[PDB]
Amino acid sequence: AVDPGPELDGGDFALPEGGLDDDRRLRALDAVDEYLTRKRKHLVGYQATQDMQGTALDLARFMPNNINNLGDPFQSGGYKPNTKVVERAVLDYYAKLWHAERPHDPADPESYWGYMLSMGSTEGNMYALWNARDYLSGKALIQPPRNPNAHHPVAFYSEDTHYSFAKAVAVLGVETFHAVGLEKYADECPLVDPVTGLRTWPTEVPSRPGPSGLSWDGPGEIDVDALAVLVEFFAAKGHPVFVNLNLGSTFKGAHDDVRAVCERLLPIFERHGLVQREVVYGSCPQTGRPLVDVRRGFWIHVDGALGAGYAPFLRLAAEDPEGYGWTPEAELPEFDFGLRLPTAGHGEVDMVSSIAMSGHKWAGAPWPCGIYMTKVKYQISPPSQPDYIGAPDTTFAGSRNGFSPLILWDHLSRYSYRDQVERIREAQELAAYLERRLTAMERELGVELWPARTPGAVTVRFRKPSAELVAKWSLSSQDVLMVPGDETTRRSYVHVFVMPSVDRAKLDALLAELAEDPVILGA
């Protein structure tokens, strides 16, 4: 099989007490560059854009600055070397793209609020679930200028949800429907397990079945029917509800049908008094009663780590296909802050409470970054009031990366909407091309590759090749059990993500190597 090339050797990097001379330092940095350069040119297995030569030329000049966007993006604060003016421009652009109300205005509850992340979307998902936990549990909101389960939120998300949510749930102590089901409602699961036929609580909301009848070969989209049954169960018990929906899922690149979910859940929320409800937020200032305000009892979060970066552009083309000269083959669901639905008796309800996106995914960046966005009306009173930063502590991070706003600003400034439509068009068409070539390879060589692509996704999955090929092309791997609870049914998959830095020549080079790979051939 192929050569992935040398790894870095730890001996070259050991840092002695006396320091390293300039020659040893440069040799080491050159080894890093040679390694990273070879790997970045061949990476096709992760949802991370690899080409930003232009941003490097333009933004290298900023590396001498210790930039810190400490505090809320909407006030400078005392740390003057900051890029909050740039950060606000990037936030504004995405607020427009996601049909949020702009400008940000602390006096307008419907207006957007958001900030740029210093980790990746893990930060945005953690923040979302923190914000939701406190909002749904009755903690105090930010300053303007009988039911025992009312304060016990329950989280719902599909089996294709990223591991950051399992992490966030544990960090924040938000209980999933699975945990609450087992603890409080052990024999009352409303779903029958398709393998066993028993009413056992599933660990996550089922995703849609594939040809097998099971989720492993399905599209990776949440089963809306299953979600609605589960949400109804807990809403009827009096619990407020947190739902995460994946817009570009980690392995399959699937898009949960956010509009279908919202249409199906709104009447459930209305029936069970979760559209508008009174909430006690601590005891009353002196005498032993409570205070009360009015809140919704549900929170829909869209994990658009990947997909919030391209879905607006695909949807633009879908709305005017002759203008963009492209009809996307798959429909991507309405998902953003513009999604508004009628009710029986509360008027139009704006359905989505928050969105996360990663900048190092579709746009590309040299480090993790991204955006969390919500609305003013959801903002929680900050944990404390630090004088020393001069700006409110409204964010998950303390010190914040102020170079990432420059990265994304530079990116966004170089492309029109039409250019952004072209980038998602080419990726969609090249993903379809890859799937076609993989099935043609199965016919030419008489090998099984198990190729699969969810319509509208920018990723294609297929049988895992040799370890050396996986290492050369940074293929991401996932094992599946074709029948849950049986380790004899394991299949090993990889996938390829067709990002804007992946072109036809790169895919053709990979395909030529797959065709001669010893695992692929010697099956």
Mask for 116-155, x = binds its own copies (CB under 8 A):
--xxxxxx------x-------------------------
User: Taking CB under 8 A as the rule, does residue 354 contact its own copies?
Assistant: no
3-class DSSP assignment, residue 456: coil
Mask for 106-145, x = binds ligand G0C (CB under 6 A):
-------------xxxx--x--------------------
Chain centre to alpha carbon of residue 9: 34
| CA distances in angstroms from 65 to 75, 83, 117, 403, listed in the order given | 20, 11, 19, 9
How is residue 29 written in tokens? 């940095």
Report the C-alpha gap between 355 and 245 in whole angstroms. Answer: 10
Using the minimum distance from each CB to its own copies, give the nearer residue, 268 or 309: 309
Region 69-88 residues binding ligand G0C, contact defined as CB under 6 A: 70, 79
Task: Name the one residue in this structure whose structure tokens are 């016919």.
Answer: 443
**Cβ neighbours of residue 108 under 8 Å, at least 6 residues apart?**
101, 376
- Number of residues in contact with ligand G0C under rule CB under 6 A: 25
> Least distance to ligand G0C from the beta carbon of 114, Å?
16
Report the C-alpha gap between 449 and 428 in whole angstroms. Answer: 20
When binding is defined by CB under 8 A, the residue of 34, 225, 293, 419 that contacts its own copies is 419
| Cβ atoms of 340 and 348 closer than 8 Å | yes
Nearest residue to ligand G0C, by Cβ distance, number only: 120
When binding is defined by CB under 8 A, the residue of 3, 23, 80, 322 that contacts its own copies is 80
Region 284-303 residues binding ligand G0C, contact defined as CB under 6 A: 303
User: Taking CB under 8 A as the rule, does residue 195 contact its own copies?
Assistant: no
> Least distance to its own copies from the beta carbon of 79, Å?
5
Q: Which helix (H) or strand (E) holds 75?
A: none
Region 199-258 residues binding its own copies, contact defined as CB under 8 A: 250-251
Mask for 480-519, x = binds ligand G0C (CB under 6 A):
----------------------------------------
> Least distance to its own copies from the beta carbon of 445, Å?
25
Report the C-alpha gap between 244 and 239 in whole angstroms. Answer: 16
How is residue 122 written in tokens? 């893990």
Which of the listed partners (ligand G0C, its own copies, none) does 483 bind, with a CB threshold of 5 to 8 Å by partner kind? none
| CA distances in angstroms from 408 to 35, 93, 156, 363, 426, listed in the order given | 26, 10, 31, 7, 21
What is the DSSP-derived secondary structure letter of residue 387?
G
How is residue 121 written in tokens? 């979307």
Chain centre to alpha carbon of residue 366: 18
> Least distance to its own copies from the beta carbon of 215, Å?
15
When binding is defined by CB under 6 A, the residue of 368, 405, 456, 465 that contacts ligand G0C is 368
User: Taking CB under 8 A as the rule, does residue 183 contact its own copies?
Assistant: no
Mask for 18-57, x = binds its own copies (CB under 8 A):
xxx---xx--xx--xx--xx-xx-xx-xx-xxxxxx-xx-
Report the C-alpha gap between 214 and 482 in whole angstroms. Answer: 8
Report the C-alpha gap between 88 and 102 in whole angstroms. Answer: 11
Residue ranges that bind ligand G0C, judged by CB under 6 A: 46-48, 68, 70, 79, 119-122, 125, 162, 164, 246, 249-250, 303, 305-306, 358, 360-361, 368, 398-399
